[PDB]
Design a protein around this nucleic acid. Structure first.
Ligand SMILES: [Mg+2]
Ligand SMILES: [Mg+2]
Ligand SMILES: [Mg+2]
Ligand SMILES: [Mg+2]
Ligand SMILES: [Mg+2]
Ligand SMILES: [Mg+2]
Ligand SMILES: [Mg+2]
Ligand SMILES: [Mg+2]
Ligand SMILES: [Mg+2]
Ligand SMILES: [Mg+2]
Ligand SMILES: [Mg+2]
Ligand SMILES: [Mg+2]
Ligand SMILES: [Mg+2]
Ligand SMILES: [Mg+2]
Ligand SMILES: [Mg+2]
Ligand SMILES: [Mg+2]
Ligand SMILES: [Mg+2]
Ligand SMILES: [Mg+2]
Ligand SMILES: [Mg+2]
Ligand SMILES: [Mg+2]
Lengths: 155, 119, 73
RNA sequence: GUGGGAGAGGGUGGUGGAAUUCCCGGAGUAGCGGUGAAAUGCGCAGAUACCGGGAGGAACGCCGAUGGCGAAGGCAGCCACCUGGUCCACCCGUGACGCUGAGGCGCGAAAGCGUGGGGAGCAAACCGGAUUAGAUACCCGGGUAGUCCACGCCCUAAACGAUGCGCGCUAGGUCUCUGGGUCUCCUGGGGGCCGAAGCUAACGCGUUAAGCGCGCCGCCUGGGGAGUACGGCCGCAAGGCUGAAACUCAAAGGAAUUGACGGGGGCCCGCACAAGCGGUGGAGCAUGUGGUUUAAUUCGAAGCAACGCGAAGAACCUUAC
């Protein structure tokens, strides 16, 4: 991206809830371009959040993502003699990418054999405020400001 | 333990650390802090953050003594010099004033080589 | 910039050689006790030169300072 | 000569405030310091940071200039004394009394030397810490001579404008310091810049000549050997001044040009990095290669830009062994 400020590629609203964030997440679940098996998976998970939660799925999802968004993160930097981990706010854009990535990442790390479950459960665990996803977020922010000594290296 | 509630705040900044000293109107220190005290060692101490932390330590520790209004007096141009002044102000302590007092010789002693280069 | 207003303007006829006219010399010193530049005092080479020699005498008498603390910041 | 002017020009005595260090008292507590990081180091026998008092040495912030003074070296806190140079005005006096200058005599930054004194900060040597492949260095902590004063000595330098001194002549513009004037500006002395003619290898110089001329002095005659040897003179010493030869090279060198280059600068690109998704590097196998082996393992390809490459087809053939 040396020339222009790479436009934020747009996305197609959901074939159900009609939301983009859903497609976004469904995409991160998809692997080898099997957008079907991906969508199915996510959707089955939405059913399970129902068969186990009074709230609609789409609402929980939003909730999960919301907790997993790291607001501060640290970025390595060269300081004429050393590499200092510098803390700085995480842009609204990167904020969401990180959230969705982490969810799928953590989820697929759970122990339940069925893929769809892991997502449903991870989402729920995220809604509550626990779970692997939400942890990475906590670890990240932990370092951010735990290096607040270099906040003056703005960047 | 004396009940002052009105004194001075010396901020000694440098490129290596920042020590803050709170004292009574006469000039006698009540309590003090520094990047070192605050917790940082060597390199970190000079950082502007340590200065914020040490500034507040000076404040807190002095709050007990009953301190309420200080007269900030900056010295040196080290980094953190400003984050200190910053903290003191927004630490309850009513900052009555700020005053640079960094000493400067009217050309007295030959500086160390590291600081010469200026004939 | 120094686009203040020149100290020589805002002032009447005065003996630049007077080392006791505190009420005027003080005008040629900064926030600190530093002697003002010509781009500020509005004087001229020869004038300025005589000013310094004067301020410095004043300073030894004790009517003028060598340096003052900077307020604000 | 008379009248005026500017100046860190020199010498002596005195004196002011800021800052560093040390000492004393107070208050205060666990660190300060220092670096890319660190450590050595200093601190609970209380350091650092803060206030008050004292001692001492060295240097003078702002003014300050792109400024001024001096023959050069060089000279800046303030005051007085002693003293050099110099510029302008008036046109008053002498009447060529001028220029230059081998040798001589004097002055001559720093370091260095001698005797005595002083010594705060700084700091060769040195003692340590760190860095490094090593570090007899760069960085950090200490530190003696010295740096300071007096007296004597040394006599060097990128002692530079790398431009000897004096006089005359040859467009201007502009900025500036100091004097005069009828003070829009004219005029004299000094500092800068741009430029006529002209000069120059070029760069550049250009009324502050590197132009055009005259006078006098010094100096050069390819590079290395060599500022050495010897002699002499001077020095307390260190060493200074003068200053070769044998031998040896075809160069050594000045300026400017086009490039290339830079752990130089500015501007700008590329899946270059960053962001991100998948993978190689592990395993088994496929294939090419190195090596090794063999009677032969045909040959070529080699960092990128050789290695599933020439081989889009090796059992015989192909096939070169
Ligand atoms: Mg006459
Ligand atoms: Mg006659
Ligand atoms: Mg000498
Ligand atoms: Mg000397
Ligand atoms: Mg001596
Ligand atoms: Mg030292
Ligand atoms: Mg040293
Ligand atoms: Mg002139
Ligand atoms: Mg002139
Ligand atoms: Mg011409
Ligand atoms: Mg040419
Ligand atoms: Mg010229
Ligand atoms: Mg020869
Ligand atoms: Mg010699
Ligand atoms: Mg002898
Ligand atoms: Mg280049
Ligand atoms: Mg592309
Ligand atoms: Mg990458
Ligand atoms: Mg493998
Ligand atoms: Mg062949």
């Amino acid at each position: 991206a040396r020339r222009r400020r790479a436009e934020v590629r747009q996305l197609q609203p959901d074939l159900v809830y009609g939301d983009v964030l859903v497609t976004a997440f469904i995409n991160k679940i998809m692997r080898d371009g099997k957008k079907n098996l991906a969508a199915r998976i996510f959707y089955d998970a939405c059913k399970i959040i129902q068969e186990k939660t009074g709230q609609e799925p789409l609402k929980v999802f939003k909730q999960a993502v919301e907790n997993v968004k790291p607001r501060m993160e640290v970025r390595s930097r060269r300081v004429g003699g050393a590499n200092y981990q510098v803390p700085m706010e995480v842009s609204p854009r990167r904020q969401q990418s990180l959230a969705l990535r982490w969810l799928v990442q953590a989820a697929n790390q759970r122990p339940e054999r069925r893929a769809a479950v892991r997502i449903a459960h991870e989402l729920m665990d995220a809604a509550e405020g626990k779970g692997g996803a939400v942890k990475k977020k906590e670890d990240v922010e932990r370092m951010a400001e735990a290096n607040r000594a270099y906040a003056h290296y703005r960047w | 333990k004396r009940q002052v509630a009105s004194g001075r705040a010396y901020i000694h900044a440098s490129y290596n650390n920042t020590i803050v000293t709170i004292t009574d109107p006469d000039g006698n220190p009540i309590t003090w802090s520094s990047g070192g005290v605050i917790g940082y060692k060597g390199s970190r101490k000079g950082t502007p953050y340590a200065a914020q932390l040490a500034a507040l330590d000076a404040a807190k520790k002095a709050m007990a003594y009953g301190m309420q209004s200080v007269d900030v007096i900056v010295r040196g141009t080290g980094a953190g010099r400003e984050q200190a002044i910053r903290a003191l102000q927004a630490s309850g302590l009513q900052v009555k004033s700020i005053v640079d007092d960094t000493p400067v010789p009217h050309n007295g002693c030959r500086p160390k080589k590291k600081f010469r280069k200026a004939s | 910039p120094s686009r203040k207003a020149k100290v020589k303007a805002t002032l009447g006829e005065f003996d630049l050689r007077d080392y006791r006219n505190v009420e005027v010399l003080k005008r040629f010193l900064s926030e600190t006790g530093k002697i003002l530049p010509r781009r500020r005092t509005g004087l001229s080479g020869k004038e300025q030169r005589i000013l310094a020699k004067t301020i410095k005498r004043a300073r030894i008498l004790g009517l003028l300072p060598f340096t003052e603390k900077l307020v604000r910041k």
